[PDB]
Amino acid sequence: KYSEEVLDELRVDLQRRFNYAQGYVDMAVKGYAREAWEYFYGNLPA
């Protein structure tokens, strides 16, 4: 008996949560992980 309005509210909440989580995690981890992988093969120093 799950309502579609409940699912829409859940979708909205989850979308905003994912947006915030991405905005954080990007600069928290991936901005460093990319350059770390680049240094792994020595491709960052140009």
Binding site: V12, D13, Q15, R16, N19, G23
Partner: protein
């Protein structure tokens, strides 16, 4: 590279000198690469729901 034209008069004599042959260089070719898009948007949103 490209081979030379085929000869049809090879009738050299016996016990003679080794005549200088036809030798040519190998032609070389080169190229270059090419280079983006624009992501113009509002972007003031997408921070809240």
């Amino acid at each position: 590279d490209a081979l030379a034209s085929v000869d049809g008069n090879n009738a050299h004599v016996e016990g003679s000198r080794a005549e200088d042959g036809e030798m040519k260089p190998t032609v070389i070719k080169s190229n270059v690469t090419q280079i983006r898009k624009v992501v113009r948007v509002s972007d003031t949103a997408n921070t809240t729901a």
